[PDB]
Amino acid sequence: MMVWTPVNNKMFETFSYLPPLTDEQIAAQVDYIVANGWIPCLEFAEADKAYVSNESAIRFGSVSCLYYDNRYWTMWKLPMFGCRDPMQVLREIVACTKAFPDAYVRLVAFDNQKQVQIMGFLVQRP
Amino acid sequence: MMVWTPVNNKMFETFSYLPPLTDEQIAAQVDYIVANGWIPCLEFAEADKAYVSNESAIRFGSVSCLYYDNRYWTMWKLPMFGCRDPMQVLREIVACTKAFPDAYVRLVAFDNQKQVQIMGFLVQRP
Amino acid sequence: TKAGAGFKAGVKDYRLTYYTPDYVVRDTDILAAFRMTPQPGVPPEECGAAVAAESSTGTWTTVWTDGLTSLDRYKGRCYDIEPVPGEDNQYIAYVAYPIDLFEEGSVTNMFTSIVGNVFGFKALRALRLEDLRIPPAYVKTFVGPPHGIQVERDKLNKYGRGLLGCTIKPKLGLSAKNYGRAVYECLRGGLDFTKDDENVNSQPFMRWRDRFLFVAEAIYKAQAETGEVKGHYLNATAGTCEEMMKRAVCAKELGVPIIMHDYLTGGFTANTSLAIYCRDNGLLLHIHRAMHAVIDRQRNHGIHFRVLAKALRMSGGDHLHSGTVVGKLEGEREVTLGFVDLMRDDYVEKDRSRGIYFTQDWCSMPGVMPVASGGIHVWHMPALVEIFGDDACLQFGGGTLGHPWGNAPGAAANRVALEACTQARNEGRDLAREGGDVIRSACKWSPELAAACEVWKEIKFEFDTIDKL
Amino acid sequence: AGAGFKAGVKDYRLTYYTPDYVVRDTDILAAFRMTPQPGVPPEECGAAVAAESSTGTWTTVWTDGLTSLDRYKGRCYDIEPVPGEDNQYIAYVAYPIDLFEEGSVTNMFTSIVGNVFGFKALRALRLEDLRIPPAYVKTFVGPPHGIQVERDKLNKYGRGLLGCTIKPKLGLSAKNYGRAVYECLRGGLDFTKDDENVNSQPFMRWRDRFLFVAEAIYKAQAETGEVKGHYLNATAGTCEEMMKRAVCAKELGVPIIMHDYLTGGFTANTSLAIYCRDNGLLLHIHRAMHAVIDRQRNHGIHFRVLAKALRMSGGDHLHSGTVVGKLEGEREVTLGFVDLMRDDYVEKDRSRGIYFTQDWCSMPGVMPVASGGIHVWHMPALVEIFGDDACLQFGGGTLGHPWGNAPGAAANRVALEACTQARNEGRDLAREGGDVIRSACKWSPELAAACEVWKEIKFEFDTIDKL
Amino acid sequence: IVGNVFGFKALRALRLEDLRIPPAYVKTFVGPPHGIQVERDKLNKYGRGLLGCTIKPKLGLSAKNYGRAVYECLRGGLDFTKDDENVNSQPFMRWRDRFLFVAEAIYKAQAETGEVKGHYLNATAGTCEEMMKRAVCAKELGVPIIMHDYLTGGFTANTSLAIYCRDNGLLLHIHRAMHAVIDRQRNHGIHFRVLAKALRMSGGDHLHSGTVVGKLEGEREVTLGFVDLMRDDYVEKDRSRGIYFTQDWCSMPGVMPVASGGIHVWHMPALVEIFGDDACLQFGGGTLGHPWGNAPGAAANRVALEACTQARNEGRDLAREGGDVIRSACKWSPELAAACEVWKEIKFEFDTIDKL
Amino acid sequence: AGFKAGVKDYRLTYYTPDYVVRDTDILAAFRMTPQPGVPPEECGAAVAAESSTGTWTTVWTDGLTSLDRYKGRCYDIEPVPGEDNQYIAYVAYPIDLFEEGSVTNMFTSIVGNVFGFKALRALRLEDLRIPPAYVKTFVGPPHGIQVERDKLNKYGRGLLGCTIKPKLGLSAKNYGRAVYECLRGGLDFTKDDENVNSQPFMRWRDRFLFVAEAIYKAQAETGEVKGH
């Protein structure tokens, strides 16, 4: 039996339980965005704003259900409406990560017919 | 089409929609009491106390549900516990109606295993 | 230091844990009798064990958490399996459930275990719950019926005969004021009760509170006219518990005697709440069994009505429809007599000739009044009185509102027929042999009854029975 | 001489079989699979069903004349013979929208399925489908949140959600429940849940469980950095007890409760869904008892109708079956009702059991929950069947892992993410599924242990609920 | 005062005989809802003992039979009937059913006789919420009086109920069920006089006092002493009646003593002599055991009480002439004569355990 | 079965020594000391009668119901060794006699009036058999031992408590001071004395607040869950 460590083992939602995505694997996910016509977007957060937290519930009555701080991160530029070129998405990933080298950065994509984020994964860890 | 009159057509529960019970028909009902081991009892009421009414609900809050005045009538003597002689019951009908010739009088019978009245019908109307 | 029984990951047969043919059932165990049809290749012992496991403590692979507790204490146990004669792949599997498995006072919880998931297992082709033994120790956790038969008769001051009711017709489409008009005319002719159709709740053609007020006027008018206590089952069935309770509260505030609820379509959680309300506020509660035949019609799959009736007795109801035997909806005589006893009586011995798989001790929970309704008319009166005796409500909806002279004459016809049959029985006449003669004589005497006798003389409902023992 | 009241019995088909009726777009439509008794023609059977689910009884009543029976009557408007059957027919019945109480699934069922299944004149009856028109859909609150809102509140995108029923079903203490829950959630499951029959019992009272489960949720969330939940069961004997349990979940700040909608019932369910809307709680719906009703092809109510009813009464999740696990659910049947649960507009498609085009007029979609006898080798099939908008639940498939719950959860999470990545890269999960799982088993020791234990476990039986 | 000291190993036995409740502590209590004067004023009943009756069988009667029995008792001349102390809510008879049928019976007997009637409806329950629900139903039926078993329900619930009765105008009859577990033995426990003071403080319009001559124990001098402690404003120390302390009630209302248990018509003179007019005398078996039924049984008790009251007022000594008074009334009233004959030889004379 | 007015022995109805007790019956064992001249059978029967359905003279209303169904039954009497006038009388009570979930009601029947009968000199209730079917009508304890240990996270040893002293006379702040100092040294719990409710020297809400401060201070200091 191997024991799953509870120490320093924080995760980042989709694809955190796999080996770190290679550049080819990231590129393949960007292709899937473009093939399905979804809207790429980058979001980032400093370390103190990266993980879900509960501080604002100090101001609440009994209404904390499904309220958490730090679900919103900061938008990099705007969603890439009309983008059908994987080069442009990979270029912004580089741009975002160069501008904020100490930040967590995630690549997401939106579906405007369901009006929901339909994919997302971490592309940078401080 | 015959029209069912609403005027002066009050009823007294079981057997009120049949022709008035002959003496023979009353005696047959008493035989049924005795055959089943039920407890005969007579009850009576003056005209003013014979019909269901609602006057005590003046004293109530919103608790009149299944409260009516005049469901209870007055007991003639006691239930005839241990009586298995139909002629004794018939004699009590005579005595009750002699004592209260202007009263409504009903013959009832009790079952002590269900603990409920198990038969009843009017034997005198003023 | 030899190792004891431990955790071994992986799938094993359910029968290694849940088939216990030497188990002696405890007097507090809930017992279930399932008519089980296994898939080809699934031994009956394994199929029964699967049903026991997946309605109690087990899942499809061994879990380590069993070792923190005592599976001996908690497991459901398939303790007996009997092949059904005349069926080559059908078995009665008996399962015992410790009383600790159940939430006190919750029919919902009991059904969730016993019938929650097992009917959908791929390893069986069909499954029917035929009976449940509800031990006294579990019966005592329920409030039960609001009043029950003796209290109801005492509140109404009605003794010595079946009660008579009537569903207002057309089912849907009548206005509130026409509803009250129909109700007054029915009640004034000799019916004890009328009722909302099961699907009359609140709708564009008639909103509930308007109906409740006009029906109150009709009840009180007919009661004053006849001198007999009258009621109309006002339907509290609703989309939400808050709406249900609003409707019960309005009945309370109008002082009227009786409401109704559709316990299966509204559901047990709402029904139990409403029964408790009726107990605390003195309202009689008539229960309609809408949807039951979705569940209870077929012999090979579902839940027999006798179990649905036990469940209602526990959740609470002063009346429950029982079928008629002879009317438009199915109900075989012996089957029906058995579950009528289970509804009314305190103690019902096992009797497989009436579909009673277990002795049932109700430990003084009130009896529920059986309501015989649907496709019955005056010529059925002798049979109904013979089948049910006096502790039943016999309901004539079409058999009142279909009388050629209108509702009051229709009501009088039914009342005369019932009283004539009651009198005849009391005089020593055998209604099974002499019923036709009794009705023919009463038809001669009463013009209202004669008109009903003529219109429905040839009308019978005689079909092959699906729900046979 | 106009039509007068004519006392007596006549055929139902004279009034209620109307094959030239033009269905209205506000009508509720029903498709019934009917098996008549010998001597009762299909048109009379269909008319009897229409009549006794709408306006009619067994003999003519005079009160019809006070209203307009043509305005209100249910109408059997078409009958088709069933292929392969010499005594089964599909009867189509149209119900005016005025027959129904706004916002009440209870009322709709009371009419359409209240009494007709017990008629002596039929041998069997099955409700296959209902067309719920937009004008009636709009009278319902519907689901508290629905799929998009749920993903937005959880902050979870790009993959199926993962859950897990705690085991033994019954018999665990409150503190052992929380212990099991923490260990499951911390390994990568999004959710755990009370078993459907875990309510409040001598071995574990509900409020004790809710508090220890809250501790476990918040411990696993802090440890993993991912939002966690546990469906705390509000199913109860009474509505007051149900609401007490929902209030306690609200006051603990936890995300999700569950309700057994058929055993608790539609009136209580609808109330609970409205409470959840008003207080921001997700509502997981368990379909306990459904197979009592929906298993047999000849009699009962198909699950697709029970699913439509739940969508209307309200639920954020509803179990959908697995297709490949221990409980029955044929693939095409299941794909059809999953669309009916999730989508806004579903065209008629008899090859998936969809008898009517269904327009949900923007009522939120309900997340299908695939649960029961599934393990890591089923992952590719589950992802292929359901796609990302589903919750896949592994109870025995987590608590039966050799190394315990955290490793068991990690195995399931790795499997799901491997399948999801493979599909995103263009791999065909229907052909390459076994290879995807094999590769992931090589890489992850936690997954490898699950792979070995359950490698040969399959559930393949003859299907009862066939189209 | 009685929490832990009775269990000390260093003593073999301990009995609390009396408590001096000072005026400054008396004044912190709401006390009885109404008290004797107010009760007589609300009922419009003066000049004689009140008459009550416990319905019988204790348990096993249906709600409708309960009301039937009540109507027949009340209509013959009893002021009150009552639920037995253990009649709460049970499978054979649920409380709200009983309350409604008893309401019908109260109002029927009141209309028939023209005298105010009541029946003590039992609010004793497993929880305070159920107790209060029962009190509320009595309020909403407009009926005059409820009862509570103060020791088996408990002082916390009793005090709450007394306050509710004060605020809603209900008379509160107190049954002392369980007291003889505590108060019977001379060497250990708490004397009833202390339990009676405690009830006066917690609150009750009536409290059972024993009969002296009936089936349950109560020595004359002991009983006379605690009756004064229950009713009076100021009671001087008197060890010959077991009064260890002068007790000043500082105008807290007096509690009506209720003499009940194994009494019949021949005990009437002794009861009137012991208690005077400010008591309720209750005849359960002594009414429902009359050979002609409850109305005649009630009339017999009412005639006996009125004959004794008239005789006392006319100067007759009931201690000496009581049998003569009853014998004279027996000869006149056929209903009384039937009771006199059935219970003529029935007495309850045993060695007393609770002696001073 | 006619009504016959008048007094008869209780044992004619309520002494049934061949009765087979039901598994739902509540059973009582009474240590009974009869008066001289009162047979034990009659004393036991009187205890059974007057704790169930009976009174001192025959009532006609018995005939409307079934006394067989409802009556309490003295079903066995054994002499006490060492005692010449003590007996153990066993009485069985149908479950229908009792209000579900009400200890108050159970005591009101079984111990309500019988201890004061003149016909006995002494009576002690020694034991009650509470059948499962009656147990199940009670909510019972809020938590119970396992749940309490689980909530406190305390296992493997007895719990330790302590009543604050002087029983009465301490102020609210001194109460909290005493509590903090007790809890911080290793006690799991402290407690109000049984007679500490709310009084001039210390009103309850003041005490609750200072005790809260003390509980939380001792818990933070020791790292062990504390209560008072």
Ligand SMILES: O=C(O)[C@@](O)(COP(=O)(O)O)[C@H](O)[C@H](O)COP(=O)(O)O
């Ligand atoms: O809707 C109906 O058909 C009825 O109103 C009867 O109408 P008629 O009196 O006009 O026949 C009753 O609800 C059925 O009896 C229910 O069936 P069951 O009693 O079998 O549950």
Ligand SMILES: O=C(O)[C@@](O)(COP(=O)(O)O)[C@H](O)[C@H](O)COP(=O)(O)O
């Ligand atoms: O009780 C059970 O069996 C489960 O907890 C699954 O346990 P495992 O994960 O251990 O199989 C689920 O409730 C079933 O999936 C319900 O069936 P369905 O989803 O078909 O409604």
Ligand SMILES: O=C(O)[C@@](O)(COP(=O)(O)O)[C@H](O)[C@H](O)COP(=O)(O)O
């Ligand atoms: O239960 C009973 O025995 C009684 O109802 C009296 O019945 P009878 O009138 O039929 O004797 C009273 O409660 C006792 O008087 C109580 O004892 P006490 O007054 O001593 O507290």
Ligand SMILES: [Mg+2]
């Ligand atoms: Mg109907």
Ligand SMILES: [Mg+2]
């Ligand atoms: Mg489950």
Ligand SMILES: [Mg+2]
């Ligand atoms: Mg008493």
Ligand SMILES: [Mg+2]
């Ligand atoms: Mg102390």
